Amino acid sequence: ARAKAKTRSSRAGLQFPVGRVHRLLRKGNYAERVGAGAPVYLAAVLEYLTAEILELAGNAARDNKKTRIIPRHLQLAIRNDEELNKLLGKVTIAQGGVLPNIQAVLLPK
Amino acid sequence: HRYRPGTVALREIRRYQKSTELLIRKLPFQRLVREIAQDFKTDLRFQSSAVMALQEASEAYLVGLFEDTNLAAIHAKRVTIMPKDIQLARRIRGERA
Amino acid sequence: PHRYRPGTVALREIRRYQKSTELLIRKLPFQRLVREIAQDFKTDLRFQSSAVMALQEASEAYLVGLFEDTNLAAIHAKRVTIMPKDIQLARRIRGER
Amino acid sequence: RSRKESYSVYVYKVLKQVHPDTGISSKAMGIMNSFVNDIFERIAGEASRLAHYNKRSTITSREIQTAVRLLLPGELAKHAVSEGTKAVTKYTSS
């Protein structure tokens, strides 16, 4: 007999999978061996970043009176944020459109 | 004797493009690097080669930026480089966004 | 008769197309262009529909970014209309040539 | 039968714990998956290079800490570091 399994995600309080990240780190040919605390830290960072982006995208979707996030909302959330835009400066999001911006010179006066 | 404005600038361009030495004084750059670094960790020590590498990279970056800025200034039918051209070059390169 | 003063329906077009996410190049001619270009590198190639779709999305995103850059280049020259020299300057400063 | 892995379950759990009355489209789930994979690859690659630079052969939390500090800008990194450290401390507490 043995104790009931407790997933390492449950142990750390996270939502993202600690075990899957551990396997991907080990099988990804990044180093000869992987420390026990590395998957937990990586999963926590990924969970935080996804939570941030999804919170901003949900706010943007609520601004559009829509209850589902679509790539346009992700694009708006990512570009409206200076630090997130800096992180994803070179990333292209399909079906995202562009941020509406017209140079002040072009506008009529 | 008095050279008309512009000729000395051209010969200076031909001189500094031909030569390969560093153009910023060594000691003030050392001090600038040291005082910038103290905002991250105190009582830091710097290898001399580290300061030299920082100076080389900084001068290369500034020279490339000035090339792009001169291109932008000439594009606007001007020959005088202006901070607007620096801003435009930085944004098009992607350093301002 | 009623005619909009030039520029206004150009501004309305800007707002119409910066709000939407749809593709701006017709799908069939772009697919034919992609196949014609790919015939140079290997004969009798087959394309997944997702591959052509991704190529189109990337191409129009790149073109939109290039058009923002050349609009900035044109405005920096104190003019509104964008000319091929503006595109060339943008590409040169971006480092693509 | 083959199996294709994805972060859809976890991304949706995070969404439902940050916006309990909001959904997400499949074409946006794919983009979130791609973002997760991209950030995973960036951090893991930086950690591998950090281990190689110092002649270590193990990837620990310190390597990922420094990778996070290197990659994420500003307050994003400042908060990711705190989240990771808190998660690791809670994991070791058990």
Partner: peptide, 24 residues
């Protein structure tokens, strides 16, 4: 206040993007 239903787990003041304005 921005937060997660597990607080200050998210940065409570995201920075706004700025854009370049050429000309005057």
């Amino acid at each position: 206040s921005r937060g997660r239903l597990r607080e200050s787990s998210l940065r409570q003041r995201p920075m706004p993007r700025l854009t370049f304005q050429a000309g005057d």
